[PDB]
């Protein structure tokens, strides 16, 4: 069964690494596995082929390359299927073998198999999509000799710019009950140009397009391996206007939950995936105009996020079914069901932008551009520390790069937000205040998930705690080098408690108190916990409608499970809560 | 002659390639023969050009494809090419085998049927494509009438099973049924034909044959494989004892049979149960004539598995 | 080691009592490879030709097979331009049939046999094979031309 399988294959991998030689001579049973592959899950199949491949492609034993042939046979047979079930399996096997034989007949075999795979993949859309995807995965993971890559990438860019790139005509030909427009361009790129992309004429012609995002990913990665990080012939794609219908929130286009509601929700979903891909692409690049274009795309993305969760609240039934192809597609073959699962999941370097300092338009990078980055990091780190590209990365390096890009960079954002809400309470337009409130809610949510990380239970990460909580103590005063654990806790919590003048809502209030709790568990000190949870229970928390939807039930249940427990006299604290519960 | 077709295919489909395809109507045979003689990559390029320029929405390309299919079928076995070209051809054909109607693939099935029956198939590698064709037939809902594609598949496979096989080519025959989606009686007739084929075999050939018979038995068809092997080796050892009234070779066989039956019941915790149920003399207590030296040897080589051990050792005792 | 064991006996054996129309010595240029000479078999187009061959002994040889090449090229179906030998006896088990009961003299005898009887089943040269299959005199003519051009003094 499942775990058995999993573990076992882990072990086999360990064993081949331990000693390829002896394994070589028991290889025959390993080949003999291949008649039983009905019961395996594709993740397990991936490692299995990894095994058999690394087995076969030991140069010292090519005489018994019989297994190479057997593998090519089964590749062929499972490929040759109308049924996706076997086709995907073959695909996977093929690509893995390719990456593994990747350390000139080597290159001839490589390109032969590759073009074979491409031909097998092409006509089925999800197949070719997966093919690009896993090819991109292989290429980022392996530094292989760039001969088939310089061979393929000059054809991929041409096929891309003839399949999708179209002259910037506003309305193309075709019968549309939807006003087609070159919309959501960043408008620094001149609209009357060549580079613009065809979406709605393609999706209506369906009743190529779905794979657009991973195809661009492969294009990005092949050009990033050739030019070594340069995106010089692609800057037009960062800022071109997109051939979209009116993406105004269609409340007038209601009582219309027919196939056209599916067209609009899927269209918004696909362009969202497209912009998610664009922000994954242009994150690592340092050019400041391209960064500001990425800022404009981040706000475009959160705009289309609110538009799409509206368009799915319109009808809750019309699933636009497109999950990521690693784990999700096999389970098949409300806004939160698609937010993480359906949509394309983003890259860890995307948070190179939130380094920039907050600006305020209520009081006087954008606040909503930072809201989207922090909301991305929140869902990302709750997914990881509790996603294809990110799962290959261990959670330790994730929390590591978080300690650098968030904690010394978003301290200035938290301080500017303290100054924002202090001025807002002094005054006490509203959308700027609430976007800042939700930006702050996501900041403290990220901090809570950061310092609720169970890796700090292990002893090697206490040096990262002595760095992180010391840079938190640094916010009150610097120079307290090589402090005790409990003193650094006291300094970090004395720094974070002072924001209890600024916290506008209650979801941010509970993330701040539980953040104080998880940093304080490292340590008498129960008085600070009880008094500070009581301070947060006793503060106003101004009552916006969504601001009090942030006073959800299980949230207060968690806050009071903390306060009534850690308060020293639990029963006298219960007597106080009862005394104050009568005059309500 | 090729580079023109390359240039026609370089840009677009079914607008100039079709037009040129309606120029050169015959001589594809000799064309492909000099092609494989000089360089097989050109044959693959021609095949790609042909299948893009001969879509099967239009029915003229369907016949070009049927002709070139028969051409490759005959040459790949007879005309001894290089290995990589042969693999490539087979892969290409298995790729484009899906774009056909029912009856064209039915007549390709009848081609292979008559060929393996009588045609001295030089290498038999062409059979790799056959189960792809059976798959396309089963799945294609373009209904026939002679009736569904899956039922015409049943007919063709019943034809093949009731028909005679080659001595050399039973390995590959059953290797094809390996990956097919089959039902009870499908797999039953497959194994029954391969079973009755045992009486015309060298003995070094039986081990991998039974290996494949069993990995196919895995589908549903467990009991009859073992029952037949039992009766076979029972009569064999009786005949050998009457001769005594190649002993070392005969032993060497029986051993590796039992080894492979062990791996089988190792992977299937039910196989041994039916094995037991087939064998248990104590249905009421009267002696069955099912057991044998080889039977018992199999049981004792089995008892070293952790589950059946005590069960078997009680059975034998009683 | 067992390499040298086989080699020291096969050296003296092929020096003194080699097969008929075959000779072989330690290659006077290499001293690790061997120089063989198969004299042009009778009833063949390869007559009037002393075909030189290079013989490589792998280090595990009684277990590995040798690796022979025709240094003097040959117009043959089964022997390519370079002089490769697509023969089962130079290949490992079930692919081929090598075992230590065979040796240099046996495989050279097999090569001399092949030079008189081309294999139409295992061709390195498919076109020379089709010529030998259908047009016998053209194949024999081109082979005798190839022999008298290169193999003759």
UniProtKB/Swiss-Prot annotation, chain A:
The domain of life for this entry's organism is Eukaryota
What are the subcellular locations of this protein?
Nucleus
What domain notes does the record hold? The C-terminal 24 residues of isoform 2 are required for its function.
| Quaternary structure and interacting proteins, as annotated | Homodimer; cannot be ubiquitinated and does not bind DNA. Part of a FANCI-FANCD2 heterodimeric complex that binds and scans dsDNA for DNA damage. Interacts directly with FANCE and FANCI. Interacts with USP1 and MEN1. The ubiquitinated form specifically interacts with BRCA1 and BLM. Both the nonubiquitinated and the monoubiquitinated forms interact with BRCA2; this interaction is mediated by phosphorylated FANCG and the complex also includes XCCR3. The ubiquitinated form specifically interacts with MTMR15/FAN1 (via UBZ-type zinc finger), leading to recruit MTMR15/FAN1 to sites of DNA damage.
Tell me the protein family, please. Belongs to the Fanconi anemia protein FANCD2 family.
Modification after translation (UniProt): Monoubiquitinated on Lys-77 during S phase and upon genotoxic stress by FANCL in complex with E2 ligases UBE2T or UBE2W (isoform 1 and isoform 2). Deubiquitinated by USP1 as cells enter G2/M, or once DNA repair is completed. Monoubiquitination requires the joint intervention of the FANC core complex, including FANCA, FANCB, FANCC, FANCE, FANCF, FANCG, and FANCM, and proteins involved in cell cycle checkpoints and DNA repair, including RPA1, ATR, CHEK1 and BRCA1, and is mediated by FANCL/PHF9. Monoubiquitination prevents DNA release from the FANCI-FANCD2 complex. Phosphorylated in response to various genotoxic stresses by ATM and/or ATR. In contrast, phosphorylation by ATR on other sites may be required for ubiquitination and foci formation.
User: Which cysteines bridge via disulfide bonds?
Assistant: none
| Function field | Required for maintenance of chromosomal stability. Promotes accurate and efficient pairing of homologs during meiosis. Involved in the repair of DNA double-strand breaks, both by homologous recombination and single-strand annealing. The FANCI-FANCD2 complex binds and scans double-stranded DNA (dsDNA) for DNA damage; this complex stalls at DNA junctions between double-stranded DNA and single-stranded DNA. May participate in S phase and G2 phase checkpoint activation upon DNA damage.
Q: What is this protein called?
A: Fanconi anemia group D2 protein
Instruction: Tell me the classification of the organism that encodes this protein.
Output: Eukaryota, Metazoa, Chordata, Craniata, Vertebrata
Species this protein is from: Homo sapiens (Human)
Name the organs or tissues of expression. Answer: Highly expressed in germinal center cells of the spleen, tonsil, and reactive lymph nodes, and in the proliferating basal layer of squamous epithelium of tonsil, esophagus, oropharynx, larynx and cervix. Expressed in cytotrophoblastic cells of the placenta and exocrine cells of the pancreas (at protein level). Highly expressed in testis, where expression is restricted to maturing spermatocytes.
User: Glycyl lysine isopeptide (Lys-Gly) (interchain with G-Cter in ubiquitin) crosslink - at what positions?
Assistant: 77
Tell which residues of the whole protein are contained here: 485 to 1210 of 1451
Curated annotation (Swiss-Prot), chain C:
* Location of the UBC core domain: 2-152
Say what the protein does: Accepts ubiquitin from the E1 complex and catalyzes its covalent attachment to other proteins. Catalyzes monoubiquitination. Involved in mitomycin-C (MMC)-induced DNA repair. Acts as a specific E2 ubiquitin-conjugating enzyme for the Fanconi anemia complex by associating with E3 ubiquitin-protein ligase FANCL and catalyzing monoubiquitination of FANCD2, a key step in the DNA damage pathway. Also mediates monoubiquitination of FANCL and FANCI. May contribute to ubiquitination and degradation of BRCA1.
Subcellular localization: Nucleus
Describe PTMs of this protein.
Answer: Auto-ubiquitinated. In contrast, according to another report, autoubiquitination does not affect E2 enzyme activity.
> What are the GO MF terms of this UniProt record?
ATP binding; chromatin binding; ubiquitin conjugating enzyme activity; ubiquitin protein ligase binding; ubiquitin-protein transferase activity
Reported disease? Fanconi anemia complementation group T: A disorder affecting all bone marrow elements and resulting in anemia, leukopenia and thrombopenia. It is associated with cardiac, renal and limb malformations, dermal pigmentary changes, and a predisposition to the development of malignancies. At the cellular level it is associated with hypersensitivity to DNA-damaging agents, chromosomal instability (increased chromosome breakage) and defective DNA repair.
What does the similarity note say? Belongs to the ubiquitin-conjugating enzyme family.
Give me any GO biological process, just one: protein K29-linked ubiquitination
Report keywords, A-Z: ATP-binding, Disease variant, DNA damage, DNA repair, Fanconi anemia, Isopeptide bond, Nucleotide-binding, Nucleus, Phosphoprotein, Transferase, Ubl conjugation, Ubl conjugation pathway
Summarize which stretch of the complete protein this chain spans: 1 to 153 of 197
State how changing residue 5 to R affects the protein, per the record: No effect on FANCL-binding, nor on FANCL-dependent monoubiquitination of FANCD2
What Gene Ontology terms describe where this protein resides (cellular component)? nucleolus; nucleoplasm; nucleus
According to the record's subunit comment, the protein's assembly and interactions are: Directly interacts with FANCL. Interacts with BRCA1.
What is this protein's name? Answer: Ubiquitin-conjugating enzyme E2 T
Crosslink site(s) for Glycyl lysine isopeptide (Lys-Gly) (interchain with G-Cter in ubiquitin)? 91
The pathway this protein participates in, as annotated, is: Protein modification; protein ubiquitination
Query: Which organism encodes this protein?
Result: Homo sapiens
Give me the reactions it catalyses: S-ubiquitinyl-[E1 ubiquitin-activating enzyme]-L-cysteine + [E2 ubiquitin-conjugating enzyme]-L-cysteine = [E1 ubiquitin-activating enzyme]-L-cysteine + S-ubiquitinyl-[E2 ubiquitin-conjugating enzyme]-L-cysteine
């Amino acid at each position: 069964n499942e775990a058995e399988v999993d573990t076992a294959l882990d072990v086999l991998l360990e064993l081949v690494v331990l000693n390829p030689s002896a394994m070589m001579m028991n290889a025959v049973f390993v080949k003999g596995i291949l008649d039983y592959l009905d019961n395996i899950s594709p993740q397990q199949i991936r490692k299995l082929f990894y095994v058999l491949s690394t087995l076969a492609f030991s140069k010292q034993n090519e005489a018994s390359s019989h297994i190479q042939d057997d593998m090519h046979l089964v590749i062929r047979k499972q490929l040759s299927s109308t049924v996706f079930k076997y086709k995907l399996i073959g695909i996977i096997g093929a690509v893995t073998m390719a990456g593994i034989m990747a350390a000139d007949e080597q290159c001839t075999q490589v390109t032969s198999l590759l073009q074979l795979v491409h031909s097998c993949s092409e006509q089925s859309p999800q197949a070719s999509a997966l093919y690009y995807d896993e090819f991109a995965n292989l290429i980022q993971h392996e530094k292989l000799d760039p001969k088939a890559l310089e061979w393929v990438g000059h054809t991929i860019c041409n096929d891309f710019q003839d399949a999708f790139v179209v002259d910037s005509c506003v309305v193309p030909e075709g019968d549309f009950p939807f006003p087609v427009k070159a919309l959501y361009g960043l408008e620094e790129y001149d609209t009357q140009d060549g580079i613009a992309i065809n979406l709605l004429p393609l999706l209506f012609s369906q009743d190529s397009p779905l794979c657009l995002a991973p195809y661009f990913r492969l294009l990005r990665l092949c050009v990033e391996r050739q030019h070594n990080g340069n995106l010089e012939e692609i800057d037009g794609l960062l800022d071109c206007p997109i051939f979209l219908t009116d993406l105004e929130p269609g409340e007038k286009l209601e009582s219309m939950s027919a196939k056209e509601r599916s067209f609009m929700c899927s269209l918004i979903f696909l362009t969202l995936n497209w912009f998610r891909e664009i922000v994954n692409a242009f994150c690592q690049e340092t050019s400041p105009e391209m960064k500001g274009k990425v800022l404009t795309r981040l706000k475009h993305i959160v705009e289309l996020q609110i538009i799409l969760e509206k368009y799915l609240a319109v009808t809750p039934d019309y699933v636009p079914p497109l999950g990521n192809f690693d784990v999700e597609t096999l389970d098949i073959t409300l806004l939160l069901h698609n937010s993480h699962a359906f949509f394309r999941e983003l890259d860890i370097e995307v948070f190179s932008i939130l380094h920039c300092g907050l600006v305020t338009k209520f009081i006087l990078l954008g606040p909503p551009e930072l809201l989207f980055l922090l909301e991305d990091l929140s869902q990302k780190l709750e997914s990881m520390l509790t996603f294809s590209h990110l799962q290959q990365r261990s959670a330790q390096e994730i929390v590591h790069c978080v300690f650098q890009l968030l904690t010394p960079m978003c301290n200035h954002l938290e301080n500017i937000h303290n100054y924002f809400q202090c001025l807002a309470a002094e005054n006490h337009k509203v959308q700027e205040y609430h976007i800042m409130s939700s930006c702050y809610q996501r900041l403290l949510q990220i901090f809570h998930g950061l310092f609720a990380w169970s890796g700090f239970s292990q002893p090697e990460n206490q040096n990262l705690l002595y760095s992180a909580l010391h840079v938190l103590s640094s916010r009150l005063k610097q120079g307290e080098h090589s402090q005790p654990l409990e003193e650094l806790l006291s300094q970090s919590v004395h720094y974070l408690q002072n924001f209890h003048q600024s916290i506008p809502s209650f979801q941010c209030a509970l993330y701040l108190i539980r953040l104080l709790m998880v940093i304080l568990e490292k340590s008498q000190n129960k008085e600070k916990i009880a008094s500070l949870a009581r301070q947060f229970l006793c503060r106003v928390w101004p009552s916006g409608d969504k601001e009090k939807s942030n006073i959800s039930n299980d949230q207060l249940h968690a806050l009071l499970c903390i306060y009534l427990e850690h308060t020293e006299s639990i029963l006298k604290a219960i007597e106080e809560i009862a005394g104050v519960g009568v005059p309500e | 002659m090729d580079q023109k077709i390359l240039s026609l295919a370089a840009e677009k489909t079914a607008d100039k390639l079709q037009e040129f395809l309606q120029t050169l109507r015959e001589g594809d045979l000799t064309n492909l023969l000099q092609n494989q003689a000089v360089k097989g990559k050109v044959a693959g390029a021609l095949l790609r050009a042909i299948f893009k320029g001969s879509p099967c929405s239009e029915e003229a390309g369907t016949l070009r494809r049927r002709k070139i299919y028969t051409c490759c079928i005959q040459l790949v076995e007879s005309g001894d090419l290089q290995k990589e070209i042969v693999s490539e051809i087979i892969g290409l054909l298995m790729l484009e085998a899906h774009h056909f109607p029912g009856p064209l693939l039915v007549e390709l099935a009848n081609e292979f049927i008559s060929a393996v029956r009588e045609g001295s198939l030089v290498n038999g590698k062409s059979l790799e494509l056959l189960p792809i064709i059976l798959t396309a037939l089963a799945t294609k809902k373009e209904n026939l009438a002679y009736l569904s594609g899956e039922e015409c598949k049943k007919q063709l496979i019943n034809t093949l099973c009731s028909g005679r096989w080659d001595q050399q080519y039973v390995i590959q025959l059953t290797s094809m049924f390996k990956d097919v989606p089959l039902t009870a009686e499908e797999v039953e007739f497959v194994v029954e034909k391969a079973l009755s084929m045992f009486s015309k075999m060298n003995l070094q050939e039986i081990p991998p044959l039974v290996y494949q018979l069993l990995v196919l038995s895995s589908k549903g068809s467990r009991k009859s494989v073992l029952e037949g092997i039992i009766a076979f080796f029972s009569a064999l050892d009786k005949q050998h004892n009457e001769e005594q009234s190649p002993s070392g070779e005969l032993r060497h066989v029986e051993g590796t049979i039992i080894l492979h039956i062990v791996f089988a019941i190792k992977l299937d915790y039910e196989l041994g149960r039916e094995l037991v149920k087939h064998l248990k003399v104590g249905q009421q207590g009267d002696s069955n004539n099912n057991l044998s030296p080889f039977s018992i040897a199999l049981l004792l080589s089995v008892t070293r598995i952790q589950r059946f051990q005590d069960q078997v050792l009680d059975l034998l005792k009683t | 080691m067992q390499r040298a064991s086989r080699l020291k006996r096969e050296l003296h054996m092929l020096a003194t009592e080699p097969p008929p129309g075959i000779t072989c010595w330690q290659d006077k240029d290499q001293m690790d490879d061997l120089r063989a000479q198969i004299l042009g078999g009778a009833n063949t187009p390869y007559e009037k030709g002393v075909f030189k061959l290079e013989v490589i002994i792998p280090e595990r040889y009684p277990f590995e097979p040798p690796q022979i090449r025709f240094l003097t090229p040959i117009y043959h179906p089964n022997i390519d331009s370079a002089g490769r030998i697509c023969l089962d006896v130079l290949k490992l088990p079930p692919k081929g049939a090598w075992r230590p009961s065979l040796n240099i003299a046996t495989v050279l005898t097999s090569i001399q046999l092949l030079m008189s009887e081309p294999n139409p089943d295992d061709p390195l040269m498919a076109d020379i094979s089709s010529e030998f299959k259908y047009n016998k005199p053209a194949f024999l003519k081109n082979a005798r031309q190839w022999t008298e051009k290169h193999a003759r003094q």
